[PDB]
Structure formats: C-alpha cells, structure tokens
From a paper:
To determine the structure of CgMCA-ICa, we purified the wild-type metacaspase in the presence of 10 mM CaCl2 and performed crystallization assays at day 0 using a non-fully maturated protein. Crystals were observed only after three months, and the crystal structure reveals that the maturation process occurred in the course of the crystallization. Regarding the maturation process, the N-terminal and the linker located between p20 and p10 domains and which corresponds to the CgL6 loop, are both cleaved and residues Met1 to Gly68 and Asn260 to Ile309 show no electron density in the 2Fo-Fc map. Surprisingly, the two monomers of the CgMCA-ICa dimer observed in the asymmetric unit interact via a β-sheet complementation between the β6 and β5’ strands. This unexpected organization being similar to that of the dimer usually observed for caspases, SAXS experiments were performed to determine the oligomeric state of CgMCA-I in the presence of calcium and confirmed that this enzyme is monomeric in solution. In addition, as observed in the crystal structure of ScMCA-I16, loop CgL7 (named L3 in ScMCA-I), which may cap the substrate-binding groove, is disordered from Asp324 to Gly335. We observed a clear electron density for Ca2+. In CgMCA-ICa, Ca2+ is hepta-coordinated by a water molecule and residues Gly196, Asp198 (Asp173 in TbMCA-Ib), Asp214 (Asp189 in TbMCA-Ib), Thr242 and Asp245 (Asp220 in TbMCA-Ib). Interestingly, the “cation binding loop” observed in ScMCA-I (Gln223-Asp237) and in TbMCA-Ib (Cys162-Asp173) is ordered in CgMCA-ICa which suggests that the calcium has probably a role of stabilization not only for loop Asn185-Asp199 but also for segment Asp236- Asp245, the whole contributing to bringing together the two catalytic residues. Interestingly, in the presence of Mg2+ the distance between the two catalytic residues is 10.6 Å, against 8.3 Å when in presence of Ca2+, suggesting that the presence of calcium forces the catalytic site to adopt a proper organization for its autolysis activity.
Metacaspases are caspase-like homologs which undergo a complex maturation process involving multiple intra-chain cleavages resulting in a composite enzyme made of a p10 and a p20 domain. Their proteolytic activity involving a cysteine-histidine catalytic dyad, show peptide bond cleavage specificity in the C-terminal to lysine and arginine, with both maturation- and catalytic processes being calcium-dependent. Here, we present the structure of a metacaspase from the yeast Candida glabrata, CgMCA-I, in complex with a unique calcium along with a structure in which three magnesium ions are bound. The monomers CgMCA-ICa and CgMCA-IMg both contain a p20 and a p10 domain forming a caspase-like core in which a two-stranded anti-parallel β-sheet from the p10 domain completes a six stranded parallel β-sheet in the p20 domain.
Author numbering: 69 to 83, 88 to 259, 310 to 323, 336 to 392
C-alpha cells in the first residue's frame, strides 16, 4: 500500500495552513470512561487508553510526564474523567501550542449527539461525548471541543485525535472528511495540522486497536495506505468505516508520520 515515491508533508505554508514536521513537543491526553456502577456501564474503554498510552510511549516516543490519563477507575479525583477534568485536561494539551508540535488526543467512552443536518444554534454541535458525571452535568458537545482543542492551535501544530466512540464522526467540528468508500471527501479556518480518526458516520474501541496494529505491523504508511489498512483491519470483525477528518485539505499521498 505505501506509495512508490512518498515525500513527507511539505515543510512550508500551503493553500491557508501549514503541516507539522512531527518533531516538536509530543504531548497526549487519553480518556477512557467505563461508567462503573451505572446502568449504562461499559467494558474495555479504560483498557483502550492504556493501550494507546503504552503504544505512544514505545513506538512513538511519548514521555509519560507529557501524558494525562483520565479514567474513572483511578483513585485521584483530579484524574477522574469528570467534565471539568476533561475540559481542564484539554486546555492543558493545547496550552503553549507552537508550530510543528505532535499533540495526541484519545477518547474511549459513550458517543451520542443532539442532531442537526448542519451546525448552527445547535451551532456545529451534533456529535457529543459523555463524561462520567454526564447524568448530572450534561454532555460535552462538538462545539466546545472545537473552541478548546482546535482554535488555540497556531499554524503548523499537529493535533492527532483518535475516537473509539460511536456517533463521533464530526466530533471535533472538522471541515473536511476523508473516507474509503470510493475515496470520499466531505466538506473560519485554522492553519493547524489537525487530523482525527473515527468510525462510521455498537462495538466501541475498535478504531484504536486497529490503529496500533496497523502502525505496529507496518510503520511506514501514507494517509491513503493508513485508511485502506484500517478498513481491512476493521471490515473483518467490526462493521464501520474509518473516517479521517481534518481542518485543512490533505493531499492524501503524503507521508503520514506520527
Ligand atoms: Ca459536527
Ligand atoms: Cl477495562
């Protein structure tokens, strides 16, 4: 699947945005909510963040002191994926964002929405995620995750998001979307290098596990080769398609470097 002559993303302003040369500060915010005790409880979501954590540390050079992990089985009330905890942790990831950084975000939990064909008044806020205290604080909507994690990024900074949740296809309000059903593309900008993986638009945690295994068993991939490999990796055991959303047009033949 890798192209014959694959040139890494061009290290210059394009047309308005700029990519990341994936060498700057490598931070990660990892969220796994299992909703223990509740009548809508889940299993494996906490284990998913662990999987992303140690993969990021081993094959991606992410130091643990740069990684915040919110999981509800922890003991530290600061690290329990409460809404204020999730929000504050998102502000930290994006804080001091500079060109060419390698931020990573991961979420494994409940996805849903308050729907609308396109976003206004229900401004952009169709997709949502549920903090562990969502029953008494409300969900964390599509728009707020844009204002926090995308806007405060300057030109050149890469945020690499990964959603294992369902109904989270446009959960970062990303303008562009790339799929692999005949190579689909599906359209206030930001020059940052924001990309995101998600499924379909309920078996959860499929998208992270396919990603580690696609990137462990073949570390050299293009934006294109990634999506076919994820589709073969998913279409066997899980019914959903990979969706790489983005904040800018991506010539998918470039080298995806994480
Ligand atoms: Ca949206
Ligand atoms: Cl678990």
């Amino acid at each position: 699947r890798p192209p014959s002559g694959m040139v890494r993303p061009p290290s210059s302003i394009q047309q308005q945005f700029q990519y990341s040369q994936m060498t700057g500060r490598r931070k990660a915010l990892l969220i796994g909510i299992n909703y223990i005790g509740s009548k809508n409880a889940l299993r494996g979501c906490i284990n998913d963040a662990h999987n992303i954590f140690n993969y990021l540390t081993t094959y991606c050079g992410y130091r643990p002191e740069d990684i915040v992990m919110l999981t509800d089985d922890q003991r530290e009330m600061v690290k329990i994926p409460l809404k204020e905890n999730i929000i504050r942790a998102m502000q930290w990831l994006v804080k001091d964002a500079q060109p060419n950084d390698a931020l990573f975000f991961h979420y494994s939990g409940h996805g849903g929405q308050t729907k609308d064909l396109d976003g206004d008044e229900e401004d952009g806020m169709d997709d949502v995620i549920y903090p562990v205290d969502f029953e008494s604080v409300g969900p964390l909507i599509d728009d707020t995750m844009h204002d926090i994690m995308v806007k405060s990024l300057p030109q050149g900074a890469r945020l690499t998001a990964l959603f294992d949740s369902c109904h989270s296809g446009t959960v970062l309000d990303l303008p562009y979307t790339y799929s692999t059903k005949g190579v689909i593309k599906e359209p206030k900008f930001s020059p940052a290098d924001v990309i995101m993986l998600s499924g379909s638009k309920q078996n959860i945690g499929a998208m992270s596990h396919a990603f580690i295994s696609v990137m462990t068993r073949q570390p050299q991939q293009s934006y294109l080769s990634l999506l076919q490999n994820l589709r073969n990796e998913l279409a066997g055991k899980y019914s959903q398609k990979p969706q790489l959303s983005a904040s800018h047009p991506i010539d998918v033949n470039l080298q995806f470097i994480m």
